[PDB]
Amino acid sequence: IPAPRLMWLYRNGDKHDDGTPFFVRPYIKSMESLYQQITKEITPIAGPVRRIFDQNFRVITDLDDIVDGAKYLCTSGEPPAAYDRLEKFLSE
């Protein structure tokens, strides 16, 4: 049983978002449960979170795929924002 993994959450389309740290507690078992807790934290101006992308724009489909310390782009069902809005999300 791992310790709670850390996600650096980025608000889709908010080019000034410097990232919001979020700890995935071990009880979270479904994606919708995770989306709900993430929505509470970052409150996207486009509605509750429905999609989370890693920095290679792969959609997260299961909790086991989350990487401690990785950065994630959260959308409300829209595609990722234009590239020039993604500089902070995409920086190493």
Numbering used by the authors: 148 to 239
Copy out sentences from the published article reporting this entry, exactly as the authors wrote them.
TgDCX is a doublecortin-domain protein associated with the conoid fibers, a set of strongly curved non-tubular tubulin-polymers in Toxoplasma. TgDCX contains two tubulin-binding domains: a partial P25α and the DCX/doublecortin domain. Previously we reported that TgDCX is specifically localized to the conoid in Toxoplasma, and that without TgDCX, the conoid structure becomes short and disordered, invasion of host cells is severely compromised, and the parasite forms many fewer and much smaller plaques relative to wild-type Toxoplasma. TgDCX alone has the unique ability of generating short, curved, and stable tubulin-containing polymers with a consistent curvature.
The sequence conservation among the TgDCX orthologues is mostly restricted to the predicted P25α and doublecortin domains. Both the full-length TgDCX and the TgDCX71–243 fragment are insoluble in non-denaturing buffer systems, but we were able to purify and crystallize a soluble fragment (AA148–243) that contains the DCX domain and determine its structure by X-ray crystallography. The fold of TgDCX148–243 is very similar to that of the N-terminal DCX domain of human doublecortin, which itself is quite similar (root mean square distance (rmsd) of ~ 2 Å) to the doublecortin C-terminal DCX domain [HsDCX-N and HsDCX-C,]. Residues responsible for the four tubulin contact regions between HsDCX-N and tubulin identified by structural docking are in most cases similar. Given the high level of homology among the TgDCX orthologues in the region of their DCX domains, we used the structure of TgDCX148–243 as a model for threading the corresponding regions in the TgDCX orthologues in Chromera velia (CvDCX1, CvDCX2, CvDCX3), Vitrella brassicaformis (VbDCX1, VbDCX2, VbDCX3), Plasmodium falciparum (PfDCX), and Trichoplax adhaerens (TaDCX). At the location reported in corresponding to tubulin contact region #3 in HsDCX-N (K53), which abuts a strongly electronegative patch on β-tubulin, orthologues that bind efficiently to microtubules have a positive charge (R152 in TgDCX, lysine in CvDCX1 and PfDCX), whereas most of the orthologues that do not bind have isoleucine. The comparison of orthologues also revealed a reversal of polarity at one position: D201 in TgDCX and D at the corresponding location in CvDCX1 and PfDCX, is replaced by K or R at the corresponding residue in CvDCX2, CvDCX3, VbDCX2, VbDCX3, and TaDCX. Both sidechains however are orientated away from the microtubule, indicating that they are not directly involved in tubulin binding. Indeed, mutations at these two residues in TgDCX (R152I_D201R) and in a non-binding orthologue CvDCX2 (I85R_R134D) do not appreciably decrease TgDCX binding to microtubules nor increase CvDCX2 binding in Xenopus S3 Cells. When expressed in Toxoplasma (whether in the wild-type or in the TgDCX knockout background), mCherryFP-TgDCX148–243 was not enriched in the conoid.
